[PDB]
Design a binder for this molecule. Structure first.
Ligand SMILES: NC(=O)c1ccc[n+]([C@@H]2O[C@H](COP(=O)([O-])OP(=O)(O)OC[C@H]3O[C@@H](n4cnc5c(N)ncnc54)[C@H](OP(=O)(O)O)[C@@H]3O)[C@@H](O)[C@H]2O)c1
Ligand SMILES: CCCCCC(=O)O
Length: 314
């Protein structure tokens, strides 16, 4: 039900994702999620909906449905806020929108730093992303002081390859180890190597886009669909479960935290009924063989950035 982090905290294995959840639909989505039993919400400043998520969290807290210590709220530091003096400000903005006084986990969204400004993806006269000269080590030192100031209980990373995680772990004077590395993971991108590396170092892995993210704005009609994969449909039918329930249970049995996104009440409910069954070792090994190394989030606009994470094997 919950995984132990290196800071002593317990992180709920199942969480509700909020990327692409419209401002006018997410408040109700989070309210239903909390009613259904979700105790973990994944957020980010760049999703442009934290205020509305915060409205839901505030209502359930006032209603006595849950107490703050029961919830595990996660947010992420965007690329345009990597410089030393901007990290605290970004964290505080997220805290005010969510209407909380601390986050359970704060992640560096991407290892790539962009030029500070109002645009999430700053462009030059040529049209490409403008990089910041900041590095991963300096941004990490700024995240560490957020822990020292009481703004966040744990800090982590997202979309960091193994060498980038290595840099943080080998940093002179390292005070706090990354608690979590949130990466893309599903049957078409199994990440066996990165997952084995992180887990050996005591870093919890959170699998995002577990259903293949069928609502990504860059979707194409010829792209493979996990939910419609006949091979996965067969495993689901063998268990009297839906394909989504199988795709959510899959990472859980690999000791990964999973965060499926949904704004639909019946689906939020369906995605929760994943604790009452088990996939056999055969089902697990079969699902792992479906790997194609297909990424939903490849951050293609930053392929030339000095800290682009996907050039290395893992
Ligand atoms: N750290 C990062 O860089 C990063 C990147 C990507 C995602 N994430 C996080 O991961 C979360 C989940 O990933 P994601 O949003 O990419 O997509 P996902 O969870 O893989 O898929 C979401 C899509 O699947 C649909 N869906 C949900 N449950 C379903 C069900 N039971 N049956 C059929 N369809 C279902 C949703 O539809 P409805 O909503 O219409 O129900 C939505 O269209 C994100 O919201 C975000 O919080 C993090
Ligand atoms: C700018 C849109 C960012 C959403 C994909 C992510 O979570 O990184």
């Amino acid at each position: 039900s919950r995984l132990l982090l290196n800071n002593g905290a317990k992180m709920p294995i199942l969480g509700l994702g909020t990327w692409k959840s419209p401002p006018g639909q997410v408040t109700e989505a989070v309210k239903v999620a909390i009613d259904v039993g979700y105790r973990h919400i994944d957020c980010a400043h760049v999703y442009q909906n934290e205020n509305e998520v915060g409205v839901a969290i505030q209502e359930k807290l006032r209603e006595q449905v849950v107490k703050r210590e029961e919830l595990f709220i996660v947010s992420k530091l965007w690329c345009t806020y990597h410089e030393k003096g901007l990290v605290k400000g970004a964290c505080q903005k997220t805290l005010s929108d969510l209407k909380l006084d601390y986050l359970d986990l704060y992640l560096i969204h991407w290892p790539t730093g962009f030029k500070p400004g109002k645009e999430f993806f700053p462009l030059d006269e040529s049209g490409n992303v403008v990089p910041s000269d900041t590095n991963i080590l300096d941004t990490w030192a700024a995240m560490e002081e957020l822990v020292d100031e009481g703004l966040v209980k744990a800090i982590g990373i997202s979309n960091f390859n193994h060498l980038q995680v290595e840099m943080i772990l080998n940093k002179p004077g390292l005070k706090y180890k990354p608690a979590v590395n949130q990466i893309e993971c599903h049957p078409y991108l199994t990440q066996e190597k990165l997952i084995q590396y992180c887990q050996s170092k005591g870093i919890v892995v959170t699998a995002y886009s577990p259903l293949g993210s069928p609502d990504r704005p860059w979707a194409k009609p010829e792209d493979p669909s996990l939910l419609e994969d006949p091979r996965i449909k067969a495993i689901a039918a063998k268990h009297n479960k839906t394909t989504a329930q199988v795709l959510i249970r899959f990472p859980m049995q690999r000791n990964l935290v999973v965060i499926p996104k949904s704004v639909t009440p019946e689906r939020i409910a369906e995605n929760f009924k994943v604790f009452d069954f088990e996939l056999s070792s055969q089902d697990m090994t079969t699902l792992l063989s479906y790997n194609r190394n297909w990424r939903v989030c490849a951050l293609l606009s930053c392929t030339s950035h000095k800290d682009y994470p996907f050039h290395e094997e893992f």
